[model samples]
Target chain A: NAEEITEKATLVGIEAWLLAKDEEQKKKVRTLNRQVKKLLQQNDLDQAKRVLDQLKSVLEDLK
Target chain B: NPYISVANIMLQNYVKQREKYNYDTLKEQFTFIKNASTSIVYMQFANFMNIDNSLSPVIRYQKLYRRSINIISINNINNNEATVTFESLAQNNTGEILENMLWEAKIGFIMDFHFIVTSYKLKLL
Candidate 1:
């Protein structure tokens, strides 16, 4: 089994990951997530997805 | 919703090229839809976008593979977390049905799929 965990747990994991990053990175992720929610609200799924893409790359880059 | 006069053209070109990239690029982005929509057409369409394989460098070197990507747990508009059970997409006569199933779940309409995972309190908002 490949670490079966709740979707919530995974979200928490991502959140925790964001929290552990440098202060700037934390601000960056928060900004990105907010941008994403806005994009979603605006019905711009593709652009929102791209913003999320950037978010993942930034998150992955964090140590 | 009213800023489409000039931005629409730019949007068109961006999406045109964007479709040429792999779905993995979109997947790397994030969303419940990307995580849940793992049917054959979705994957095949992904590979079709990146035939030269520049977009997915990691998977480009990788061989054919398959496994459960994630266990999806959904919460409806009512704040009730519901387990989704999905029908076998392959049993359908056409991609149209599969497309419907995936998209419906994507937009958070309705679907059912099976999985096992531990519960953790969560909310998208």
Candidate 2:
């Protein structure tokens, strides 16, 4: 249940982030996000969307 | 999350709020229903929803018991919020007519809620 929630939440978050701002960093963030989604769809996470994920709040919150 | 985001979007055009819709306290009912099937229950809340859909923008408020079954698979995180979808099946003394939102859902309660001119896009006043 939580994993499913993570997927949906991530999708929504990606959409919101995409709409939240128009910036160079955001472009990179979104691109990586797309890659991760593709990985998830393909069930291949060998190389996850690290960059996009890095932008995720949890990661960004560290600094 | 879908419902809240949709409500936020419709109510404030997706503008972030200080303290938005929080159903945290709703867990109070967890004691009664927690089957993990997502039982698909309709929530009845206490509030007055006034819908106006008349030639002269007729406004009317009716206090009633109402609940909605969530119709969207919520996708939310810090970057995103939730949105609500609905499966509207209508019957008027005849066969029922169903309207499916596909992967989309509304954000909140009834607006003008008219069929013709508006489809939940309440002009955001």
Candidate 3:
């Protein structure tokens, strides 16, 4: 399930990155994206999902 | 008079909308009739969003760096109806495929001749 959620999170990251208008916003997205990747690599899916929710919220705000 | 092109357009739009998480627009692509229902479609979308309660597909080392769908075959059922078989793949920035899936769906037109998908099934092959 971690792999599945990681894939979804990766897509969300890409979507947020695409929507990012400013360098500041893009930096935040990249930071969160790295956190997600790290959490996923560590097999901490629960934390990964939480970070993914944060990433989703960031995307929603950008939109 | 074949509907193969119509089916292709509908499916491509469906996949694009999914990539954008545009469910509102995605829902408009399908119409339920008789035995067909939107529940399966909803489940699939939910799975893609990682919100499904059931067991999801195991996709490792895959990144949706670029997503694309390829039509494998099309079966023209009639002048207004066709079934499309296709594969959806997630590729990295270099265009190497990370994940692939097979799917088949029936598409048709409404009274106004606007194309709408009627039924679909997906396999993680």
Which candidate ranks first by TM-score, i.e. highest?
3
Look at candidate 3 and tell me the lDDT of residue B75: 72
Off by over 4 Å in 2: A1-21, A49-53, A57-63, B1-125
TM-score between model 3 and native = 0.41
TM-score of each: 0.29, 0.27, 0.41
User: Interface RMSD of every candidate?
Assistant: 14.0, 15.0, 9.2
Please give the DockQ score of every candidate, comma-separated: 0.03, 0.01, 0.05
Candidate 1 lDDT over A1-63, as tens digits, reads: 111111212232244232444666546655665565566567777676677667666656664
Instruction: Report how large a share of the reference interface contacts model 2 reproduces.
Output: 0.00
Cα lDDT tens digits for candidate 2, A1-63: 323423333433333342333466455544555555555556555444443355465335422
Per-residue lDDT over B1-125 for candidate 1, one digit per residue giving the tens place of the 0 to 100 score: 14322333322222223222222333343242234334332333333322223434222322222111212333233222232322212112222331112211212111223221112121221
Tell me the alpha-carbon RMSD of every candidate. 18.5, 19.1, 10.2
Angstrom error of the Cα, residue B36, model 2: value is 7.6
Best by lDDT: 3
Question: How would you order the candidates by DockQ, starting with the best?
Answer: 3, 1, 2
lDDT of each structure? 0.34, 0.30, 0.56
Q: List the residue pairs that clash in candidate 3.
A: none
Please list the residue runs of candidate 3 whose C-alpha ends up more than 4 Å from where it truly belongs after superposition.
Answer: A1-63, B2-44, B51-64, B78-81, B106-113
